[PDB]
């Protein structure tokens, strides 16, 4: 009963948000609404089937909406907004077009067996195509307010800053004048500052996920 968020924690530490920007989203879309919840944090499987059977895949991250189950962190950006009593945040702007290319390409940046040095030459132009229109709107990666593109990307940018920072601390130039200031906003609000992981426990959970 109530919002029972059932989520992968850090590797080794079932009390902190670690290597999953995917679970950090679920906190973000409810903290933007200010709606209260509880976070059942799982280290890899250390909580039994009652915390996993909420997923149609058996995979965390997933949610109960007062025991009424909902599937994974990438369809939660619709289904946790659809079933909410507080205002839905699922609304896709024009920024969802470029943001849907950034969404997997920044996961592949953290799995760059295929070179990141060649990948980054597309990521700078993906960031420019987003940033060139975001600098007209001002504050958030979905435009004037937080909606689905911030829900797709916001903790994944902080996970890139932390986990890519461990081996290739890739700078955002001031020409990306929304992106470079929006990363500073992730250290603020309820919707981003509460979803911040402990940073060693992002890196030590991301290492085997360069492979897996
Ligand atoms: O979004 C992210 O990228 C990495 C890996 O998944 C890359 O495959 C990480 O661990 C986190 O979940």
Automatic annotation (TrEMBL):
<feature type="domain" description="GST C-terminal">
    <location>
        <begin position="66"/>
        <end position="212"/>
    </location>
</feature>
<protein>
    <submittedName>
        <fullName>Uncharacterized protein</fullName>
    </submittedName>
</protein>
<dbReference type="InterPro" id="IPR004045">
    <property type="entry name" value="Glutathione_S-Trfase_N"/>
</dbReference>
<dbReference type="GO" id="GO:0080151">
    <property type="term" value="P:positive regulation of salicylic acid mediated signaling pathway"/>
</dbReference>
<dbReference type="GO" id="GO:0033355">
    <property type="term" value="P:ascorbate glutathione cycle"/>
</dbReference>
<dbReference type="GO" id="GO:0140547">
    <property type="term" value="P:acquisition of seed longevity"/>
</dbReference>
<dbReference type="InterPro" id="IPR044627">
    <property type="entry name" value="DHAR1/2/3/4"/>
</dbReference>
<keyword id="KW-0216">Detoxification</keyword>
<dbReference type="InterPro" id="IPR010987">
    <property type="entry name" value="Glutathione-S-Trfase_C-like"/>
</dbReference>
<keyword id="KW-0808">Transferase</keyword>
<dbReference type="Pfam" id="PF13417">
    <property type="entry name" value="GST_N_3"/>
</dbReference>
<dbReference type="InterPro" id="IPR040079">
    <property type="entry name" value="Glutathione_S-Trfase"/>
</dbReference>
<dbReference type="GO" id="GO:0045174">
    <property type="term" value="F:glutathione dehydrogenase (ascorbate) activity"/>
</dbReference>
<keyword id="KW-0318">Glutathionylation</keyword>
<dbReference type="GO" id="GO:0004364">
    <property type="term" value="F:glutathione transferase activity"/>
</dbReference>
<feature type="domain" description="GST N-terminal">
    <location>
        <begin position="10"/>
        <end position="88"/>
    </location>
</feature>
<keyword id="KW-0560">Oxidoreductase</keyword>
<dbReference type="Pfam" id="PF13410">
    <property type="entry name" value="GST_C_2"/>
</dbReference>
<comment type="similarity">
    <text>Belongs to the GST superfamily. DHAR family.</text>
</comment>
<dbReference type="InterPro" id="IPR036249">
    <property type="entry name" value="Thioredoxin-like_sf"/>
</dbReference>
<dbReference type="InterPro" id="IPR036282">
    <property type="entry name" value="Glutathione-S-Trfase_C_sf"/>
</dbReference>
């Amino acid at each position: 009963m109530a919002l029972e968020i059932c989520v992968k924690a850090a590797v080794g530490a079932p009390n902190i948000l670690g290597d999953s920007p995917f679970c950090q989203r679920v906190l973000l879309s409810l903290e933007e609404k200010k709606i209260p919840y509880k976070s059942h944090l799982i280290n890899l499987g250390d909580k039994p089937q009652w915390f996993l059977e909420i997923s149609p895949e058996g995979k965390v991250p997933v949610v109960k909406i007062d025991d009424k189950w909902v599937a994974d962190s990438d369809v939660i950006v619709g289904i946790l907004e659809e079933k909410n009593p507080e205002p839905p945040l699922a609304t896709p702007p024009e920024f969802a077009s470029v943001g849907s290319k950034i969404f997997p390409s920044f996961v592949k940046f953290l799995k760059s067996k295929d070179p990141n040095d060649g990948t980054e030459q597309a990521l700078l132009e993906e960031l420019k195509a987003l940033d060139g229109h975001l600098k007209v709107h001002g504050p958030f990666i979905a435009g004037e307010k937080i909606t689905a593109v911030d829900l797709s990307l916001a903790p994944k940018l902080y996970h890139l800053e932390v986990a890519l920072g461990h081996f290739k601390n890739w700078p955002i130039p001031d020409n990306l004048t929304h992106v470079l200031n929006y990363i500073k906003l992730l250290f603020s609000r309820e919707s981003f500052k509460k979803t911040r992981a402990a940073e060693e426990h992002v890196i030590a959970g991301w290492e085997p996920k360069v492979n897996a």
